[PDB]
Design an enzyme around this catalytic site. Structure first.
Site, PDB file in Angstrom:
ATOM      1  N   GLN A 191       0.636  -1.325  -0.091  1.00  0.00           N
ATOM      2  CA  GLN A 191      -0.015  -0.012   0.171  1.00  0.00           C
ATOM      3  C   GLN A 191       0.762   1.243  -0.131  1.00  0.00           C
ATOM      4  O   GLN A 191       1.834   1.225   0.626  1.00  0.00           O
ATOM      5  CB  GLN A 191      -0.884   0.012   1.277  1.00  0.00           C
ATOM      6  CG  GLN A 191      -2.336   0.671   0.892  1.00  0.00           C
ATOM      7  CD  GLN A 191      -3.203  -0.412   0.741  1.00  0.00           C
ATOM      8  OE1 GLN A 191      -3.225  -1.241   1.741  1.00  0.00           O
ATOM      9  NE2 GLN A 191      -3.996  -0.367   0.016  1.00  0.00           N
ATOM     10  N   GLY A 192       0.376   2.262  -0.853  1.00  0.00           N
ATOM     11  CA  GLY A 192       1.148   3.597  -0.877  1.00  0.00           C
ATOM     12  C   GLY A 192       0.002   4.889  -0.486  1.00  0.00           C
ATOM     13  O   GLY A 192      -1.176   4.140   0.073  1.00  0.00           O
ATOM     14  N   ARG A 200      10.727   6.118   5.316  1.00  0.00           N
ATOM     15  CA  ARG A 200       9.626   5.175   4.699  1.00  0.00           C
ATOM     16  C   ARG A 200       9.131   5.641   3.429  1.00  0.00           C
ATOM     17  O   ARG A 200       8.541   5.194   2.701  1.00  0.00           O
ATOM     18  CB  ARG A 200       8.529   5.171   5.474  1.00  0.00           C
ATOM     19  CG  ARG A 200       7.634   6.240   5.737  1.00  0.00           C
ATOM     20  CD  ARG A 200       6.279   6.223   6.613  1.00  0.00           C
ATOM     21  NE  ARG A 200       5.838   7.332   6.856  1.00  0.00           N
ATOM     22  CZ  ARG A 200       6.334   8.327   7.739  1.00  0.00           C
ATOM     23  NH1 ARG A 200       7.321   7.694   8.842  1.00  0.00           N
ATOM     24  NH2 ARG A 200       5.695   9.383   8.077  1.00  0.00           N
ATOM     25  N   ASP A 229       6.999   9.260  -2.107  1.00  0.00           N
ATOM     26  CA  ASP A 229       5.385   9.457  -1.756  1.00  0.00           C
ATOM     27  C   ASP A 229       5.223  10.543  -0.681  1.00  0.00           C
ATOM     28  O   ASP A 229       5.910  10.494   0.369  1.00  0.00           O
ATOM     29  CB  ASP A 229       4.809   8.047  -1.079  1.00  0.00           C
ATOM     30  CG  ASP A 229       3.346   8.178  -1.334  1.00  0.00           C
ATOM     31  OD1 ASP A 229       2.687   8.915  -1.643  1.00  0.00           O
ATOM     32  OD2 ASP A 229       2.790   7.140  -0.838  1.00  0.00           O
TER      33      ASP A 229
HETATM   34  C1  IER Z   1       8.179  12.124  -5.265  1.00  0.00           C
HETATM   35  C2  IER Z   1       6.732  11.564  -5.218  1.00  0.00           C
HETATM   36  O1  IER Z   1       7.223  10.117  -5.411  1.00  0.00           O
HETATM   37  C3  IER Z   1       6.029   9.525  -5.453  1.00  0.00           C
HETATM   38  C4  IER Z   1       4.787  10.216  -5.509  1.00  0.00           C
HETATM   39  C5  IER Z   1       3.628   9.273  -5.302  1.00  0.00           C
HETATM   40  C6  IER Z   1       2.359   9.678  -5.402  1.00  0.00           C
HETATM   41  C7  IER Z   1       2.061  10.903  -4.757  1.00  0.00           C
HETATM   42  C8  IER Z   1       0.707  11.294  -4.957  1.00  0.00           C
HETATM   43  C9  IER Z   1      -0.169  10.933  -5.952  1.00  0.00           C
HETATM   44  C10 IER Z   1       0.202   9.760  -6.398  1.00  0.00           C
HETATM   45  C11 IER Z   1       1.457   9.393  -6.231  1.00  0.00           C
HETATM   46  N1  IER Z   1       3.697   7.863  -5.283  1.00  0.00           N
HETATM   47  C12 IER Z   1       4.900   7.289  -5.387  1.00  0.00           C
HETATM   48  C13 IER Z   1       5.007   6.034  -5.193  1.00  0.00           C
HETATM   49  F1  IER Z   1       3.848   5.125  -5.089  1.00  0.00           F
HETATM   50  C14 IER Z   1       6.198   5.281  -5.046  1.00  0.00           C
HETATM   51  C15 IER Z   1       6.428   3.834  -4.726  1.00  0.00           C
HETATM   52  N2  IER Z   1       5.946   3.476  -3.834  1.00  0.00           N
HETATM   53  C16 IER Z   1       6.248   2.274  -3.756  1.00  0.00           C
HETATM   54  C17 IER Z   1       5.590   1.024  -2.689  1.00  0.00           C
HETATM   55  C18 IER Z   1       4.947   1.733  -1.411  1.00  0.00           C
HETATM   56  C19 IER Z   1       5.822   0.670  -0.586  1.00  0.00           C
HETATM   57  C20 IER Z   1       4.850  -0.439  -0.293  1.00  0.00           C
HETATM   58  O2  IER Z   1       5.950   1.427   0.731  1.00  0.00           O
HETATM   59  C21 IER Z   1       6.542   0.605  -1.500  1.00  0.00           C
HETATM   60  N3  IER Z   1       7.008   1.633  -4.606  1.00  0.00           N
HETATM   61  C22 IER Z   1       7.761   0.651  -5.066  1.00  0.00           C
HETATM   62  C23 IER Z   1       8.558   0.575  -6.174  1.00  0.00           C
HETATM   63  N4  IER Z   1       8.730   1.824  -7.100  1.00  0.00           N
HETATM   64  C24 IER Z   1       8.181   2.856  -6.590  1.00  0.00           C
HETATM   65  N5  IER Z   1       8.422   4.023  -7.223  1.00  0.00           N
HETATM   66  C25 IER Z   1       7.220   2.888  -5.541  1.00  0.00           C
HETATM   67  C26 IER Z   1       7.368   6.141  -4.996  1.00  0.00           C
HETATM   68  C27 IER Z   1       7.111   7.518  -5.163  1.00  0.00           C
HETATM   69  C28 IER Z   1       6.051   8.339  -5.100  1.00  0.00           C
END
Ligand code: IER
Length: 288
Positions: free
Chosen positions: A22-23, A146, A160
């Protein structure tokens, strides 16, 4: 009212392999997208979906928050690659960070640690991404191990920020990371670059403790009181003086007295690796 554009990708080209966890707005999947990167017919991507428990109000928030990332081009900030705005689920495709979040990564290093020079590296990368965001008039509000991601080559990037953003705030008033929040953030809900610098200090502390929970043994309500009344995290066991000096600068009760992210980078640019000159925002022509 989201208007599809350049960034819109055909749902056909996207493939969701497996859940990563989940994000901010819903489940993030590992996957593959056709022709979202130049000179790369197929790309390994992270795909965030808005759940089906999502109001139209929240489905729109999701896209607009993602759309902020369209304006971002920085080596140390996780890149948006494309958007699927039409049909359900609504998708946001982005750079896959193959070693997951910095917190998990740091937890994995516990009696199988990182050197001083390997920690300075992480600090500078995070600081550089944050300097880039503050240059583009963006306050993260949820900087923390995180929400920092680790790439295949161990580059750390700003991730995120969704988690803390309300649907309504600014126009109207009705989730807070208390352990990462500055006093003015706790007291008045003020979030500035200077509040992001406070959080950055807490991430250094996370890096030096291999992600202990900051203020462990205090409840969230206790941390709110403690930090507002001038409380500070204890210097971690065998923490380099270089780093704790940086934490103290970041945890100045008064925001005015805190360093900028640029100032933080200046103070450690000597100990940064050679590559950092070519990839960084600090050294980029874009820097002021
Ligand atoms: C600087 C802003 O960056 C972002 C903005 C966002 C974002 C912010 C607002 C609305 C929509 C999207 N969403 C991001 C994101 F979903 C990820 C992300 N999350 C995970 C999962 C979650 C967990 C389970 O903690 C590990 N990832 C696994 C592999 N690769 C990833 N890129 C990734 C990364 C960077 C993000």
């Amino acid at each position: 009212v989201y208007v599809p554009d350049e960034w819109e990708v055909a749902r056909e080209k996207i493939t969701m392999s497996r859940e990563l966890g989940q994000g901010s707005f819903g489940m993030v999947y590992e996957g593959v997208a056709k022709g979202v990167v130049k000179d790369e017919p197929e790309t390994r991507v992270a795909i965030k979906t808005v759940n089906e428990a999502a109001s139209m109000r929240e489905r729109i928030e999701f896209l607009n928050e993602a759309s902020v990332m369209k304006e971002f081009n920085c080596h140390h900030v996780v890149r948006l690659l494309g958007v699927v705005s039409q049909g359900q689920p609504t998708l946001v495709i982005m750079e896959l960070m193959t070693r997951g979040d910095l917190k998990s990564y740091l937890r994995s290093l516990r009696p199988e640690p990182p050197s001083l020079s390997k920690m300075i590296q992480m600090a500078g990368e995070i600081a550089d991404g944050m300097a880039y965001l503050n240059a583009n008039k963006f306050v993260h509000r949820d900087l923390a191990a995180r929400n920092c991601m680790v790439a295949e080559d161990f580059t750390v990037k700003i991730g995120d920020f969704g988690m803390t953003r309300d649907i309504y705030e600014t126009d109207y008033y009705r989730l807070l990371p208390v352990r990462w929040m500055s006093p003015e953030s706790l007291k008045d809900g003020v979030f500035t670059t200077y509040s992001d610098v406070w959080s950055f200090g807490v991430v250094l502390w996370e890096i030096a403790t291999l992600a202990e929970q900051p203020y462990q043994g205090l409840s969230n309500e206790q941390v709110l009181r403690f930090v507002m009344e001038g409380g500070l995290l204890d210097k971690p066991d065998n923490c380099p003086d270089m780093l704790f000096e940086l934490m103290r600068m970041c945890w100045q009760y008064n925001p005015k007295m805190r360093p900028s992210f640029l100032e933080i980078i200046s103070s450690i640019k000597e100990e940064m690796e050679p590559g950092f000159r070519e990839v960084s925002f600090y050294y980029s022509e874009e820097n002021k």
